[PDB]
Subunit: 270 residues, 5 copies
């Protein structure tokens, strides 16, 4: 980031001394039209940055749903079938594996470490077999439910109550998948990314005729404004991906595991 | 790149502007940058709001197609958990659900669904479906039959029937949504007026920029016009989300992803 | 397009501006561009927000009308799947559902339903409907008794009676949605302040632009007029979306579509 | 219209500016338009956003009332379809539903409900309802009694008791909605700060404009002041949409339509 | 708070008035035109960023709305479905009310053991406190009262679910506030805009001084107030659960919820 700040000082220091030689040549740059170009570029940046934040908000929200759906899915099992702790333990395995599996999915990293830690090596094979493991896990979770229904422990009515929670989970898998694959640029945020770049360097060549030796000091401030806002938006265009923060996605998979363990009394120590 | 016509009609409107600056004061015409800043800022505000509407629309498209994937996934899944016996009923419903996705992509693209419909369904059904003045919506009706019969046959209760019915509702809203998108363009008025005044402005600009820049006019009267046109194209770039080229939604891609996800779920 | 009345009343105002510029420094009226530059930008900002708030009402109007097709489509579908036999009820229900679309088009346009209502229904009904304070609400109450009877008859169970009820809810939300949009104008004075102010700014702008551009004034003032004036009517056409203008919602097309859809092959299904 | 009380202050501020312009160098006060351009623009951006946030509150108000009408009609229609016999329950319920609408109107407007409540309810109820510090919550609670009775009568199944329960939910959210809107004002800073800045900016402006415009200052300076002052009172009017102003919500109108609607549905 | 900032700006104006004498004899110009540009840009960005903070504050205030609505109707469902079972009434209302109070605490990073022991037996208070999310646990315990009523045939699976859903709704509120709290907006939306509005505000006098001479301090302090007000109006609404006076009144909100849930269950506050 700081690289484009200092190509500017160079461009200013150039524009100061090279301001001499088009004295005789008749090619001038006022500030009046660059101020127009700038006020424009800043409107578009403000609108664009706005869409990026909205993209980030949807990711935060989607993940919060994982926590809620999983918490209330486990709560329904305890409230409805308070005895079936072998089932409780199994379903809580699948939910926790889904969180971890999804975080690994959006990050394009390996899930095998977290999966074997959580599920039997038949299942870990069936899940790593599938092209859609996160979906696969939800399918397996759904079996432990539908089985308690064959077994008669769940009625169609109380089966339905829990199924709606696997729905909430399924909309999240799709929800994040769509956020991740979709480039909100369509590589067209590479247009704005560069138009800001051009304007930001042509700026001293228009500012120098007003500010003399001040040109670098003011031409970098305007640049650090315009470049921050752009890169701060390009960041939130990809909120799971490589250009993102992992502390929340990891603290989130950790909280849900902690919450699900505490909810089935595997914590505290006996 | 119908854009790169007025990008270089500009350089030619910058040179008509340079060599005919001389005559200006004698004709009594002056072009100052001050009102073109006013105009351009008012255009740029309007362009900004208008792009926003267009992006919201593209998003809404990407979203609806996203829901086909969710609703059909969970619908297969519900069928597995609730009737794990009935793989006859599984492969039937899965083929309608796959057919729906493909029949919708065609309809939105105005292409012929008969190929895929026959790959996926018995000729009886392909006939039934294509008879309809609304075949995608019909495919849904046929999928709901397999569900309904299963209920008639006692295998689904009213409750579990309801659980799967709501998945056909989600799909039924995806159809209405795409139909509405493919037929309600952002009023031709919004797109015609803006596209007009952005053009008129971008070509009167070098006449007003010349007093301040002398020969520097093209290298800047273009850089300004690219910014105001790139932004008006990018809005027309996303007003056809169901097209078959460039930035338009990869409906063919998505349709496969659906078919693969859905066979993966049923061991095929 | 009474816009072109004033697009030219402005040319006659640019003209008054030019044949009074050479009594200027005599009458002592210094008049510059930079405060009208402020006035323009302030108006554009408020025109930008106002026009966006209009498109939203239009968008919402369009969406509600979409919901009619969806709710009515799957309402038919549920009858064809749950009571596939009862085609005498199928037709009774479809008849009402299409009365709804036409009736609501009339309600929102303030035209006489009686034509359409008779084309579609028995006359004992056409009277009872036209008898009612809210007719569209009454059509909806008749569609309910159709469902309600089938439930009493025992053909529909409580569950599957409920499944269809929700769809009449979906439609009662579309009713109130369009009343709210129609009977609620954009709060008053929003139009008077924002429409008074843009005319006035359009006809004073040449008086202060003439000093800078000289003759170019009618060209540049009419340009700025077409920009600020088309945008103010564009926002006004959208305020009323159930209107009869060409930019309004095509409600007769939409009701036809609904009708062709619910009678795909004369209400006949696979 | 204390805007016109404010607008004339500006025109006397303008004559003041004109007469006291000459002694400017004699005092050393240079005032250009350019920094007021920056400032005034910034005010417009903030006003734009601020005003926008208000129209939201107003719209949300409107929609909550919109749902009262929807929720109460379908609650009535569900009774006329599930229990077309039991008219004793229809009267008791429609009376309770229409009481709710009126109890809420009076609640939001801070007015005595006892007129409309007595007019629609028995006296053992009206005393116990006004007894409550939450009378509209109480009406809803009594409205659920009738439903729950019918279910314990066996005239409603749990399933059809369910279907109607969900409209009481719908109405219970409308309560909370309006209650939240009325108590929660937009942070008492958005309307306070911006009214200061607009007011003060309007006053100083002719002192920056007069150097340029001279005797013209009153005209240009009172125009610019009108634009800003008007766009600022719009957002003030919407701050409380449940008031009595001509530009607030017609709640008396709204509540009669609800009472005619539910009465025409019951043949009364 | 920002009243020192205004003052420091005056000093910077006064510094700039005295220091204008050495200007071109030190090699500098400063036009107003470039700062109108940068200044407008900052206003646009502040305009959007402010808009995002109002949204968080609206949603915080909104989620707390749903706490009341959900609990009021979970109570109404009990009364109307099981009017007899008034022991279930009191016990459920005690967890629902304790849920509110613990959520207030959770958000505020303060200790609920007081409010908890007021409301619930100690077997519960210890059980609740052992949890890494006591509000979750409280929901679990209010879930059993509903659940055991279903095992005793007093609630069918249908009417159980009716009330279960309100429990689900509350769980959404909980996850929602937890999400509004643990996620601040990208912290860059502060260091960027706070630096930039500050830096712009203390150099504006240096550039206005040519145009306005002595007039520089007033105009410069007006423009600085307008930018600095609109800046911090977004900082307040960034922790809407905090204890600042503009933050949400969670204690009043929490009482209205108790008052509401008692007024429904015969007992009088
Ligand atoms: Cl366990
Ligand atoms: Cl357990
Ligand atoms: Cl199969
Ligand atoms: Cl009656
Ligand atoms: Cl609720
Ligand atoms: Cl009746
Ligand atoms: Zn949920
Ligand atoms: Zn357990
Ligand atoms: Zn733990
Ligand atoms: Zn779903
Ligand atoms: Zn199978
Ligand atoms: Zn295309
Ligand atoms: Zn639907
Ligand atoms: Zn039929
Ligand atoms: Zn409803
Ligand atoms: Zn001239
Ligand atoms: Zn002339
Ligand atoms: Zn009746
Ligand atoms: Zn009687
Ligand atoms: Zn009284
Ligand atoms: Zn609720
Ligand atoms: Zn009780």
């Amino acid at each position: 980031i700081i690289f484009r700040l200092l190509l500017n000082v160079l461009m200013s220091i150039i524009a100061i001394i090279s301001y001499q030689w088009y004295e005789q040549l008749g090619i001038h740059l006022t500030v009046a039209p660059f101020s127009l170009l700038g006020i424009a570029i800043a409107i578009f940046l403000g609108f664009r940055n706005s869409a990026s934040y909205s993209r980030f908000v949807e990711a935060r929200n989607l993940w919060g749903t994982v926590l809620i759906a999983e918490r209330t899915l486990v709560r329904q099992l305890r409230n409805i079938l308070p005895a079936e702790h072998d089932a409780h333990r199994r379903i809580v395995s699948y939910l926790v594996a889904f969180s971890w599996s999804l975080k690994h999915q959006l990050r394009k990293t390996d899930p095998t470490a977290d999966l074997r830690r959580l599920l039997p090596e038949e299942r870990v094979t069936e899940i790593l077999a599938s092209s859609m493991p996160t979906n696969r896990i939800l399918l397996l979770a759904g079996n432990e439910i539908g089985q308690l229904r064959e077994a008669g422990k769940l009625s169609d009515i109380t089966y339905g109550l829990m199924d709606n929670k696997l729905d909430e989970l399924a909309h999240v898998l799709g929800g994040c998948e769509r956020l991740a694959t979709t480039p909100v640029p369509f590589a067209y945020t590479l247009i704005l990314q560069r138009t800001v770049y051009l304007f930001c360097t042509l700026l001293p060549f228009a500012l120098v005729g007003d500010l003399h030796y001040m040109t670098p000091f003011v031409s970098v401030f305007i640049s650090y404004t315009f470049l921050s806002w752009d890169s701060l938006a390009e960041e939130a265009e990809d909120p799971f991906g490589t250009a993102a923060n992992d502390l929340p996605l990891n603290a989130m998979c950790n909280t849900i595991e902690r919450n699900l363990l505490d909810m089935t009394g595997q914590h505290p120590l006996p």
